[PDB]
Structure 1
Amino acid sequence: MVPISPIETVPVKLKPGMDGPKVKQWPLTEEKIKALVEICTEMEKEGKISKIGPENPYNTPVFAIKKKDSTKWRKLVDFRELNKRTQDFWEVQLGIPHPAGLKKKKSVTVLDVGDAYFSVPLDEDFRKYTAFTIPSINNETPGIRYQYNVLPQGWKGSPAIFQSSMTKILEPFAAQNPDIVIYQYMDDLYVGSDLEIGQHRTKIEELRQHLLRWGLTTPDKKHQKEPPFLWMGYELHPDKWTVQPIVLPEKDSWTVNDIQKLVGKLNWASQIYPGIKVRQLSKLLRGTKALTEVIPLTEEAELELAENREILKEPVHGVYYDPSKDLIAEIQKQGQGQWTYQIYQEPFKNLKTGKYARMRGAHTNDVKQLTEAVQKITTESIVIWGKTPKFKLPIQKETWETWWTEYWQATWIPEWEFVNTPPLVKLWYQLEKEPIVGAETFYVDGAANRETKLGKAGYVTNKGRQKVVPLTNTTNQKTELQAIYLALQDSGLEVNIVTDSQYALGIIQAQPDKSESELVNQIIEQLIKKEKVYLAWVPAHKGIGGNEQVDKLVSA
């Protein structure tokens, strides 16, 4: 015999305070019992389980399932109860590689390591918790009792411990062979390289020889799987990648559930198909979650769906990452809070694409949304490539400079250049820093009664211009905005406005260009038409002239 290195066991514990499972074995038919005994005798001969005495008090139920269209029974040990009681483990699969971060490879070989799986021993002190019982024929003798010596299929810790064990074994090979990449998925190792096929196949042989040090055998008849690989919803090819086929169904009427599956397909597609849009289709999912309810598609949702079908007409592929070249990210505004982007290195060859949607909020503007989209792409790019792309943005350098120097928050976007591709992001209005000489001064106020919802909004000016409007179904906040709106409506192109509304100042100082409030939207439209606006705040109820007069008029 050739000595082999043992695979070190991972020590395993139950959660604090918990004991092992003690679950009743279900009754089985005489036919299922004979099948399980045969199966377990083979497993025992292979070292995977061992018979135990009657002292062990734990138990997990075992089942027999007919492998469909076969007289072959299959065993199922149901570890749901032990899993609830088993400690949490470190999970590595949490982060999956994105295809766009991979490197092109000339050759990728697959190796089956299914037999290696159960060379992995289970912590000797944990085995007792895996006990199960085959019932006896006619229940006239004690059932046969077994426990696992290897990682059981379906037990909570088996994926993590298998992965950790294989990683430890592969570490030295990978380190001493930096000209290959190795990736484990399920019971297969994928080995890629840029070596000529001869040297590449030599590396594979050497890996098989390395694995033999632990007694892990790999099939000689080489794997049937060969590029392209279907993996995690992608298609990986040697020199390009894409998503698996995206087919939007034809439907005369659409259900809640159908729309959820359509949006999921579109979201999946948006990582390589440029320009996918989902706003109007996601609008139909607002609030409701009755999975069978039918919703009429608005005309705007049909337009969006139609546009997406066109985008999905023919296949699109991404290229892989070349670390020797800069990464570039370009962003376009699509309308209704939607943004789309492409990341590339050579012109017209995208590594990937994607999209960003406006966050839920009362007020917003395009510059803020562009900024959020940039941060999202930056963070995604650190994940995939470990570096920030150079940005191409549809906003003039002078617009950005004005925005960030005057904005009340700190804000930053990394190295970028203007791309003159409409629609451009611009500043729709800017307020004055100083009062305007020669411009009429409007002192505005509004008030409402909380019981009747009746209110008033209005202004008085230094020229004696005055207006008060009676309002119904309103609030203090709404009347304060209404007063500013009236002053904007009734003034010339330059205007000073004096308000005591901290609420209205808080909104206007946020510089929105769009709002969920149609009153704020009306104010924005008036601001866009002015040449100069200065907005001054004063405290309420302090005898400030102008403010005092109009407050009396509107609170009457």
Structure 2
Amino acid sequence: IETVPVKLKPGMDGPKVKQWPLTEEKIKALVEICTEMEKEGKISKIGPENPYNTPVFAIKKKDSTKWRKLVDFRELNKRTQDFWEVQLGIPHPAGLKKNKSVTVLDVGDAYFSVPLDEDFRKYTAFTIPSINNETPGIRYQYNVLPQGWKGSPAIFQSSMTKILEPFRKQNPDIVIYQYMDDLYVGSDLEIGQHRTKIEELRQHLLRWGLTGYELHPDKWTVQPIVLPEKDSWTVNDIQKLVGKLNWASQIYPGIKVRQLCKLLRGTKALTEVIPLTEEAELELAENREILKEPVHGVYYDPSKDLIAEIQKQGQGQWTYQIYQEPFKNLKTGKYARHTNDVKQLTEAVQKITTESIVIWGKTPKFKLPIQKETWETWWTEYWQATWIPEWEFVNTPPLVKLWYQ
């Protein structure tokens, strides 16, 4: 097949990213894969003439013993963003989020039938480390569309539209959205009926080569900021109550506390109870009534990076908020869990991303309450998605934690 030409976002060139030390287990794992792909001719050893680099990890993927090879095309994706997004873009169905059931299917295998632009391949170079620098890394590059590179679907689009056509024709009320290597399939069908249409779909895929995971979007109801209920309200509890409330303004519209704050006057012991006025009992109400109902005013700007921030609560509990502009939350939630901090944080990260793809078609920039170095050594031990969102490491502000607890 004639190859589609890929131009690197002008004035800048290939990704020259450093490769993490991998473990002996991962390196062998990986080496097998590449020897295989090499024979199948999807990748070919490359020379010193290639100054590029992309990292490569080895993962497992939920319910599987076989290692899969994961390529970190984050940098390349940045450098190729015109092509894949403002050139060969895939549109995202608003409808998908309203579907009663969304099933996820790996479609990544599709790509290796396709040839990567010969002038492009050099960009896809990746190394296979060696323990204690004993030897030189195995350097390779791509002949066919790689998995993880956002440019891949952009190309394969047309080809996937044919593969899907009839199933679409026949099932007018099923949504098929493709993101990277995955296919999103939604229906408001009965479960077994849904499950079936999927198996049916799988079959269609099968004829073209391509060989699930179950979400229910529509029941993704909020995580309303929660003001407590209680008989016997201490100063402490109020100093607390305003704090949360006070902070939920400048985010939540029409918030109020003027009467609440009234309650607090003079250097009063915190351990001292104070009866409540039944108008301040209203802002409890009026706000609590607001607190549950979504922000008025916050809309999604398709031209604005999304941010997901996550907090460690305790006891396997974590909280997260997606927003494009601080305090202006497009979505909040909580995620609760052989699980360690990193294992859990990892699982949340993927969960938030999946919702994110499903809702907005794009992945948020994660702000992680961990140490880069820790996050870097471990994350691959629990990572399962074929995509990798972007992250920054951060130090949660004491307040932010409870304000959202």
Normalising by structure 1, we get a TM-score of: 0.35
Alignment of 1:146-161 (within 5 A): 146-158=140-152, 160-161=154-155
Q: Deviations over 1:21-52 (max 9, x none)?
A: 44565677767644542453355466553323
Shift of 1:197: 9.2
Change in 2 beyond 3 A, CA 1:210/1:39: closer
Change in 2 beyond 3 A, CA 1:186/1:101: same
Cα distance between partner residues in 2 of 1:34 and 1:413: 22
Change in 2 beyond 3 A, CA 1:118/1:65: same
Higher mean Cα deviation, 144-153 or 304-313? 304-313
Cα distance between partner residues in 2 of 1:401 and 1:129: 24
Shift of 1:13: 1.6
Shift of 1:206: 5.2
Q: Deviations over 1:70-120 (max 9, x none)?
A: 999886644455345435135399999999967987987665545446555
Cα distance between partner residues in 1 of 2:190 and 2:64: 45
SS in 2 for 1:103: helix
Aligned to 1:267: 246
Change in 2 beyond 3 A, CA 1:160/1:369: closer
Q: Deviations over 1:385-427 (max 9, x none)?
A: 9999999999999999999999999999999999999999999
Shift of 1:428: 40
Aligned to 2:334: 355
Change in 2 beyond 3 A, CA 1:246/1:175: farther
Change in 2 beyond 3 A, CA 1:165/1:281: farther
2:230 is aligned, of 251, 261, 276, to 251
Q: Deviations over 1:269-288 (max 9, x none)?
A: 99999998899999999999
Cα distance between partner residues in 2 of 1:66 and 1:407: 8
SS in 2 for 1:235: strand
Change in 2 beyond 3 A, CA 1:74/1:215: closer
Cα distance between partner residues in 1 of 2:95 and 2:110: 29
Change in 2 beyond 3 A, CA 1:275/1:307: same
Contact persistence 2:223–2:333 (CA under 8 A): no
Q: Deviations over 1:278-325 (max 9, x none)?
A: 999999999999999999999999965653324567999999999999
Cα distance between partner residues in 2 of 1:352 and 1:425: 16
Change in 2 beyond 3 A, CA 1:396/1:76: closer
Contact persistence 2:96–2:358 (CA under 8 A): no
Number of aligned residue pairs: give it.
Answer: 403
Shift of 1:213: 3.5
Cα distance between partner residues in 2 of 1:246 and 1:335: 17
Q: Deviations over 1:200-235 (max 9, x none)?
A: 78765653443233211xxxxxxxxxxxxxxxx999
Change in 2 beyond 3 A, CA 1:297/1:28: farther
Contact persistence 1:240–1:317 (CA under 8 A): no
Shift of 1:53: 4.2
For CA contacts below 8 A with separation 6 or more, give which structure has more relative contact order: 2
Cα distance between partner residues in 2 of 1:18 and 1:404: 30
Shift of 1:19: 3.6
Change in 2 beyond 3 A, CA 1:88/1:97: closer
Contact persistence 1:100–1:318 (CA under 8 A): no
Change in 2 beyond 3 A, CA 1:212/1:312: same
Change in 2 beyond 3 A, CA 1:208/1:247: same
Change in 2 beyond 3 A, CA 1:247/1:208: same
Aligned to 2:130: 136
Cα distance between partner residues in 2 of 1:126 and 1:421: 42
Change in 2 beyond 3 A, CA 1:401/1:175: same
Cα distance between partner residues in 2 of 1:279 and 1:266: 11
Change in 2 beyond 3 A, CA 1:246/1:35: same
Change in 2 beyond 3 A, CA 1:183/1:292: farther
Change in 2 beyond 3 A, CA 1:106/1:295: same
Change in 2 beyond 3 A, CA 1:378/1:291: farther
SS in 2 for 1:96: coil
Contact persistence 1:257–1:292 (CA under 8 A): yes
Pairwise CA RMSD: 19.6
Mark the structure with the bigger radius of gyration: 1
1:186 is aligned, of 180, 186, 189, to 180
Change in 2 beyond 3 A, CA 1:105/1:72: closer
Normalising by structure 2, we get a TM-score of: 0.44
Change in 2 beyond 3 A, CA 1:396/1:43: closer
Higher mean Cα deviation, 12-21 or 283-292? 283-292
Cα distance between partner residues in 1 of 2:200 and 2:80: 38
Contact persistence 1:103–1:320 (CA under 8 A): no
Structure 2: state its 5+ residue gaps: none
Q: Deviations over 1:305-353 (max 9, x none)?
A: 6533245679999999999999999999999999999999999999999
Change in 2 beyond 3 A, CA 1:281/1:308: same
Cα distance between partner residues in 1 of 2:218 and 2:55: 48
Contact persistence 2:152–2:180 (CA under 8 A): no
Higher mean Cα deviation, 279-288 or 203-212? 279-288
Q: Deviations over 1:468-508 (max 9, x none)?
A: xxxxxxxxxxxxxxxxxxxxxxxxxxxxxxxxxxxxxxxxx
Contact persistence 1:234–1:242 (CA under 8 A): no
Q: Deviations over 1:130-182 (max 9, x none)?
A: 11222445656543211134444554534644666534532454246535443
Contact persistence 1:272–1:352 (CA under 8 A): no
Aligned to 2:390: 415
Change in 2 beyond 3 A, CA 1:325/1:69: closer
Identity value in percent: 99
Contact persistence 1:134–1:145 (CA under 8 A): yes
Shift of 1:57: 4.1
Contact persistence 2:101–2:214 (CA under 8 A): no
2:368 is aligned, of 377, 381, 393, to 393
Structure 1: state its 5+ residue gaps: 1-6, 217-232, 358-362, 431-556
Cα distance between partner residues in 2 of 1:249 and 1:327: 30
Higher mean Cα deviation, 368-377 or 204-213? 368-377
Cα distance between partner residues in 1 of 2:382 and 2:335: 23
Higher mean Cα deviation, 61-70 or 401-410? 401-410
Change in 2 beyond 3 A, CA 1:266/1:364: farther
Q: Deviations over 1:353-386 (max 9, x none)?
A: 99999xxxxx999999999999999999999999
Contact persistence 1:104–1:320 (CA under 8 A): no
Cα distance between partner residues in 2 of 1:154 and 1:82: 10
Cα distance between partner residues in 2 of 1:37 and 1:156: 24
Cα distance between partner residues in 2 of 1:194 and 1:284: 50
Shift of 1:128: 1.5
Cα distance between partner residues in 1 of 2:388 and 2:20: 63
Which structure shows the bigger proportion of residues in helix conformation? 2
Cα distance between partner residues in 1 of 2:149 and 2:140: 16
Q: Deviations over 1:177-208 (max 9, x none)?
A: 53544344665545556889999787656534
